[PDB]
């Protein structure tokens, strides 16, 4: 029936990456979660008037299993590359995540978005202009999100779906 998009979230650990998918798939208006629940990572949405099913893989917490990255990434059609705006190292990691995705997918043009995540009130160290410049150099969109207010979360996932649809 409706199209299912397999999305994969990648990025450094320990800096709130998991809040992106939790806030999306959540009961938006009840701050609660059981990730063990079958299809706590599947969500039917309407994007530009077209209903589809998002299947989101977020292996947050498994970052030390670095030799499993290919196994996980191979499942995906589009990728959210996430860094924290108060963690410069996580921003510097983005280049290698993108290179690894290109290699797994055997393509120079994989649907992907760059996401800068605000995970606390600690001082921002990556300015939006730096991240915009990086995204432009890659030819991909940039979305900033809050890990607390849900701002930007729908835009991040919907923009990625549009990237897949327009590939």
Partner 1 sequence: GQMRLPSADVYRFAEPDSEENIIFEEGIPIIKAGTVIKLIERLTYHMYADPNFVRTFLTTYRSFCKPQELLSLIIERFEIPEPEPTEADRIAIENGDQPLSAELKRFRKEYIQPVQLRVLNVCRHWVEHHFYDFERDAYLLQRMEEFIGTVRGKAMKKWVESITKIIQRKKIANITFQSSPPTVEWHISRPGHIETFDLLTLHPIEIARQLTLLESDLYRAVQPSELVGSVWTKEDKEINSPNLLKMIRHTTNLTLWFEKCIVETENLEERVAVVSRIIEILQVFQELNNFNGVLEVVSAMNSSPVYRLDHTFEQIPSRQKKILEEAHELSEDHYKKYLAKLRSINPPCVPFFGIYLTNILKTEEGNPEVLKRHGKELINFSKRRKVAEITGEIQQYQNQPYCLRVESDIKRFFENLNPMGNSMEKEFTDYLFNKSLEIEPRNPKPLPRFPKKYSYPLKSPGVRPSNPR
Ligand X SMILES: Nc1nc2c(ncn2[C@@H]2O[C@H](COP(=O)(O)OP(=O)(O)NP(=O)(O)O)[C@@H](O)[C@H]2O)c(=O)[nH]1
Q: Is 14 annotated as a binding residue?
A: yes
Does position 159 bind ligand X by CB under 6 A? no
Partner from partner 1, ligand X, Mg ion, none contacting 107, C-beta within 5 to 8 A by type: none
Does position 166 bind partner 1 by CB under 8 A? no
Site mask for ligand X (CB under 6 A), range 70-99, x = bound: ------------------------------
Q: Give least dist CB 124 to partner 1, A.
A: 18
DSSP per-residue letters across the chain: --EEEEEEEEE-SSSSTTHHHHHHHS-TTS----TTSTTSSEEEEEETTEEEEEEEEE-TT-TT-GGGHHHHHTT-SEEEEEEETT-HHHHHTHHHHHHHHHHHHT-S---EEEEEEE-SSSPP-S-HHHHHHHHHHHT--EEEEETTT-TTHHHHHHHHHHHHHT-
Q: Give least dist CB 13 to Na ion, A.
A: 15
**Site stretch for Cl ion (CB under 5 A), options 51-59, 62-70, 100-108, 132-140:** 51-59
Binding site for partner 1 (CB under 8 A): 2, 13-14, 16, 18-19, 22-23, 25-29, 31-46, 51, 57-68, 70-72, 74-75, 96, 100, 103-104, 106, 149-150, 154
């Amino acid at each position: 029936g409706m199209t299912e998009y397999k999305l994969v979230v990648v990025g450094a650990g320990g800096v709130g990456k998991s809040a992106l998918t939790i806030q999306l798939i959540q009961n938006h208006f009840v701050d609660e979660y059981d990730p063990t629940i079958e299809d706590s990572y599947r969500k039917q949405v309407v994007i530009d008037g077209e209903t589809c099913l998002l299947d989101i893989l977020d292996t947050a917490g498994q970052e030390e299993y670095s030799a499993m990255r290919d196994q996980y990434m191979r499942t995906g059609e589009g990728f959210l590359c996430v860094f924290a705006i108060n963690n410069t190292k996580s921003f510097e990691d983005i280049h290698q995540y993108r290179e690894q995705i290109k290699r797994v997918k055997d393509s120079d043009d994989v649907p992907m978005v760059l996401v800068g995540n605000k995970c606390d009130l600690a001082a921002r160290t990556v300015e939006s202009r730096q991240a915009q410049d990086l995204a432009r150099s890659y030819g991909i969109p940039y979305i900033e999100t809050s890990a607390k207010t849900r701002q930007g979360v729908e835009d991040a996932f919907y923009t990625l779906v549009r990237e897949i649809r327009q590939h």
